[PDB]
Design a protein around this ligand. Sequence first.
Ligand SMILES: [Mg+2]
Ligand SMILES: [Zn+2]
Ligand SMILES: [Zn+2]
Lengths: 483, 1337
Amino acid sequence: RTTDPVRMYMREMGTVELLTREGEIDIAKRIEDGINQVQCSVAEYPEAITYLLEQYDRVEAEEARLSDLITGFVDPNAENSIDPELAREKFAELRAQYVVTRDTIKAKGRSHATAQEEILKLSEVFKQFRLVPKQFDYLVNSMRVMMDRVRTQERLIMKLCVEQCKMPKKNFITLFTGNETSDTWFNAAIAMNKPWSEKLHDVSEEVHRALQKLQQIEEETGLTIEQVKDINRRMSIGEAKARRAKKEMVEANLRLVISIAKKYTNRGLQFLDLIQEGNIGLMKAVDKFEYRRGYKFSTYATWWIRQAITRSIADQARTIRIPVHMIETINKLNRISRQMLQEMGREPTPEELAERMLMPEDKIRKVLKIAKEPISMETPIGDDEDSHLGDFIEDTTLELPLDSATTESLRAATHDVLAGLTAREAKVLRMRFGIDMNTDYTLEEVGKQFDVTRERIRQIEAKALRKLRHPSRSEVLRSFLDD
Amino acid sequence: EEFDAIKIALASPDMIRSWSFGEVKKPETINYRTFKPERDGLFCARIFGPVKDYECLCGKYKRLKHRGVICEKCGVEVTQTKVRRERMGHIELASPTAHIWFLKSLPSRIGLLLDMPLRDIERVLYFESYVVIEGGMTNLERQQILTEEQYLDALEEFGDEFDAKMGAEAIQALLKSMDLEQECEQLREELNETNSETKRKKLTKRIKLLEAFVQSGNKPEWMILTVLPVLPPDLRPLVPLDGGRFATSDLNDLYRRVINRNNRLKRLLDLAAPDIIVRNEKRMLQEAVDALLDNGRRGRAITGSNKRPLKSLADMIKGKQGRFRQNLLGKRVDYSGRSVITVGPYLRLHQCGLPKKMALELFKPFIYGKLELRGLATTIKAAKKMVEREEAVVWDILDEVIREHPVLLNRAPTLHRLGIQAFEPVLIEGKAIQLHPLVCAAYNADFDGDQMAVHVPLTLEAQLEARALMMSTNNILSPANGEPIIVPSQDVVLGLYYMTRDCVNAKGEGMVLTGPKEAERLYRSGLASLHARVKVRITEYEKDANGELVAKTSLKDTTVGRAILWMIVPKGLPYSIVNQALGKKAISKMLNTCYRILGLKPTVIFADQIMYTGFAYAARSGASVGIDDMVIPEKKHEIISEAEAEVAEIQEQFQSGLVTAGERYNKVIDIWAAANDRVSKAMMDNLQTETVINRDGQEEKQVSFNSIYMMADSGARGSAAQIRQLAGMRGLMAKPDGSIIETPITANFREGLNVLQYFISTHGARKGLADTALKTANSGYLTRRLVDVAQDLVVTEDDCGTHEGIMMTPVIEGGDVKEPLRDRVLGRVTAEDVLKPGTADILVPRNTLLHEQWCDLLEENSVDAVKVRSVVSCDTDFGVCAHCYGRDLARGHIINKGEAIGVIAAQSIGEPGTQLTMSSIQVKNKGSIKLSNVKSVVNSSGKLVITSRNTELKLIDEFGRTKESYKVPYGAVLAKGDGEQVAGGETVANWDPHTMPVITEVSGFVRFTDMIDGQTITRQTDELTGLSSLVVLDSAERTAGGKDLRPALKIVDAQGNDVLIPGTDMPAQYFLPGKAIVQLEDGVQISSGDTLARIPQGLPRVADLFEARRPKEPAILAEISGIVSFGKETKGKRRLVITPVDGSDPYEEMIPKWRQLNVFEGERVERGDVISDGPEAPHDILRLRGVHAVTRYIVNEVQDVYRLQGVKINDKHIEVIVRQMLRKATIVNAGSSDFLEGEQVEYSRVKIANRELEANGKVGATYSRDLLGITKASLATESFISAASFQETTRVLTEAAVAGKRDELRGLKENVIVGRLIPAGTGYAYHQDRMRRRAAG
Ligand SMILES: [Mg+2]
Ligand SMILES: [Zn+2]
Ligand SMILES: [Zn+2]
């Protein structure tokens, strides 16, 4: 009755084993080949072939770049510090292939051997450019989404046509999907005969109205219909190729993952967290790898997953997040602490250690304000289980009732004082400080409200201080002087 | 604020959407340096609320220019704060994981419903095996598991037409599938097809869950979690310290945990993984979820570097630790204090020592209002300044406050209502609290390091409640008993004893007085003895007239102390009570007479003066005690040497090999204990009456001069035992084994121990001290459960108009009176008109207050039994009439409505139990004899022998009310009869205490028949004499050829007939079991009453008694009247062919005939007749008998357990809880509701008080009556909150929520914790006003 999923998962992964040294590179081959045939699929789609020089002129049209996107782009590998000379070189042949391509795809259409061998070398000059990152996903999404439109169209049309006519479907299968543009399929079905074909009403408008949106996607796309269903299938296969291929390899090296794991299982955190994460960094390490480098893949994914885990522990693993500059500084400290302790034989001072670490005690101490973690309210600082620490604290945030009474007595005595004043005086002195109000009216507006005056207000103010200050009304304050 | 009632329900997901203010999105909370709430983390003010007044974080919007202007940069509010304790955020989940309380706990509530095993579902939900969501084809079946590899078979076979997955997705769907109604009618239907027991209850169970979800509208899919709340920070906070050091709660971890996992869930789910990792991840997730609800439930708990578990959400509600027992029902308090304590000997009742600073700081705002009023301190700053300035006026002002301002006195452990009190303040220049010492007797307190706490009645209501209710003048007795609780404890008693004292010795003998004033003058002149019988005159008074004193006067020869003492006395009494040495029992009853006759205040003030004068004349009396007051006799060494040369006798006897150890052991301890007794007697005769002092004569002897005896005689302290220990040997000693030591003690503390004697003294001392260190836990535990039961109960009504209840008869049995029926009755009220032995002399019209005039009027009468309207026979729904209760004792009159009761018995019963754990029949005197329920016979002696076991003996007096009572065995032998008279001291009965007689009442021949050697029996002819009979073996030893054949030697005549039972055609022969060996052979004859054969041979108790605890070993009984034969031949147990007269025979049950039977294989019983031997269970009694018998049994049992220890409580208390155990009765018939189900017998009585009324002749159902264990009786409650407070809480809460239930706050516990007023007593009137408001809309 083992509920521990440790046992479960380790059993379930012990299921699988590893293979080596050519099934590995066979999977690489399979992957890259299916990818090259999705690349072929890209080099198809005539007016969408040319999503190379368009976006390439795009990244070029800002007069010079080597930055993020071009560091994504071509990046050809060698069985570069980008020199823009070759960039400028490669905006001349591409346009040439374009113009000579748009000339021939209309000459009789698309069945002409030299034309499609020119499209083959077009696909080749396309294929000298690697299947570089994000930008082409879009370009595939461009082709991915439109698929999900014709898949829309058909699925609509079927429901309208199939559910009715009289006979179930099969003639519809063989008829509509071929023609789908004129009503000649109808007369082709009626090639057989019958008296029940002579009656057709009440759906004639719906068929060609539904059709009316069909050709609209042609201008959206600019292609035949057959080649669509060709390239959909072709590319999907070139994808699924690699999509499968690695799950052999992913499941292959798992024992290595754990093996290198229990290097860094230095008790700071929990298993499945770290396990999951190592699998994750491994996902990349698989996604990225070059066998032609000819090395052991262990080394590759070791680098990758080391990084992944080394940063994920630092991100997580505390109550407070602590960015990494602190972290690396802290690890330096932890190592040279021990080094300098061997040197000294003793604890080092911030003095000579600031010297050796080559920077002042400022940062030392600035760090040492950080080095602590929290200590969990509910601990028993009551040794007998009598008072856990949380029970000691008072909240010194709200207020004290005696002081509320104090300030209320203040406010009421000021009401009493101000009650003995001239109307203009106390109204000025109220609204000008927002006493009694949510407001605090001030200088200019009064002129713009009352009339003008500003300075004689000040003069009034001082004389009011005169008549009130004289220690006859100043005593309801004189103990709030002590406030 | 005000609201009517509460409710539980199932929170929809959109309910939480409604509750929530924003969704949470990260694990972070703050910066490292700018200790700041981060957005979208934990403490994001944007969703939970702001710190300060009108300050967005970047300060963009400010000072009400931009009032309701969320600062768009930081997205932060502006408006007012204090919602970081209110607002709960939320989180939307990726996928559904389940709640656990509706899964893991007993009966599972979820798969419980689904009629599926748990482990199956585990295999689904540990993601191990797929399972049929739905068999698209019925080729396969819903609720059918497919392993993930056999699933492949099912799959590649078909692929399409099945639904089978592995997860809550598979399951919510199932819930989302399944339709309730059809299932419900189906179970209802096919129950009636086969409604066998387990089947039927299971069908009922599922129908209940069904119709519950129907009519609730609560829903099955709501078990499972797709959105999750998040709490306000202030319940889960994080703060710093003065050191810059930070401190957090557990839960902020766990919230944090899940975030990242859900992040790593969704993060992965961007990335198209194998399912295996997803399974693993989901496991991590729902594991964290469990950990939230319970760290350590499903498995190995979870810790930080603490190495200790993280506290559950649940743990906040739990044990004591949660809100209930720590923070809600017990509370810290403002305006209270404490201090060390001491005595005020001078003081009076209402007074109390008070170190003044205490009241000073505690009465501050009185003084500040008062100084503003005087305007010396015009306002309060200066008031406190002047306070620091220490002006005399303050103190006057302080006194000027303190007058008439009562106050509360508090000691713990508080075991009953009297352990705290309410006094009036008195100020003092010390830091030790002086008080009226006697009430230590109430508090069980002593001035040896005790200390106490104090509280204030600020409000006038409290002020006056104090002055009126727990004013001590309003509280002088127990409610347990009519006992004066202010017994003069230790010294006053003794000084008074010494005073009222009749030497002959001192001087001034035989003179005469006018009155005690000159007695003072005369002794005080130094002429006289305060202890000397001499003549004086008195003038005593009596209220013989209409409560109207009737004066008179005459002389007495009395001691001088007593004359003096009369001066205190308030003029309504004789001299006879004061006519003696006045042991403290006399004081008890004396003060008793005072309030019996005058009432309170005379007795009060009288007692105060008695305390005073006791101090006075005891401090005069002169006293000390020393080495020579401790005295040893001389006749000790010789008894010692004598028995010493006899222990050596039996020593040499064992050396020769004669006696055993146990013989030797018992007899040696007998002689040593006898020597102890002789030593005690010697010193008693040598110290009690030894002194030879002459006085106008040769020699004279009277009350001792040792100084020790009258310490015990006063009752102040001590008794013969302790004094024996000081003087003589102090009994024997034991190692904690429980064994008994052989060589006793010789020395005492006057002489001095051996090494070994003290070494040994160690042991039982340690033992019993350990016991003393632990019986309080069980005590508090039990008493706590007792209050936990009976919180509901309060009087409601004057008279329930009910029909009769209990009968009262004294409990005298086996000795003299143990409870006078007088004492039973007093303050009760009759069930019934009640006449006298003078017939038809009714004096109650079914109910009078049975005060002591009535009781005397009785005790005249020879009446010996009477009925009383019982608390049980009361029928008030949800409370009682005061009549079925009668009187409040320490009131001393009829109970008024409104005061709650169950608590009262609880304090009565729990408090004392702390102290509590630590042949022949011979007539005594003459008297009438009363035996009945009798079959017996003139035996072959001519005397009397029982032939119906029912009967037992009594010695009835010549009158008719009993003297003695003793059990009498079936067929034991007598020397007497019933309806006769006999001399005292006369062995009337005898029997072999080994034999259970097989006596033949018949007279008929013996012939060996039905029985053959070594088939049913053995033949074992006695080697010595020669006579024997066919010798019956036990169940096992006989041979199996006739072991199924009941052996029975048969009674015949000269012809061979069956000598039928005299009076009935039933044959008479004995299917003889083991040990029924007969001695005389074939052809022989027996007599009437002739044995053919013979048959040769505390605290946890009561804990079980009230618990509804139940034995294993019943002296099993007759289910139904009529004849019986025995049954199947022992496939583990024999069975029992019962046969009613007119009923139905077939009932028969497994019997271990290994243990002895009462009735035999051809012998008849009436119902209610024991069949085996042993203890028995209560449920058997209810199930068969009436009630009065039952309750009467148990009360007798446990009252004896008390009284054993010399313990005194009225029976009324114990009646009470009975009706609280009885809150449920199981149904018999049907037609109203479900068939049998236990339900409120109250509400049963309601519905039949509507429905079986001409609503219907009958639609509804008759009903059984039931019983419950006490804790689960507490659980079985309409409310859940009292049920939820303390034990098995989680489960109750779940069960409460599933039906979306609610409560109405009628039990007091319910209305406490909300801060409302009590539904009783003081708030009775208010809350009934509110009641009629609820009645009036
Ligand atoms: Mg004490
Ligand atoms: Zn701001
Ligand atoms: Zn009643």
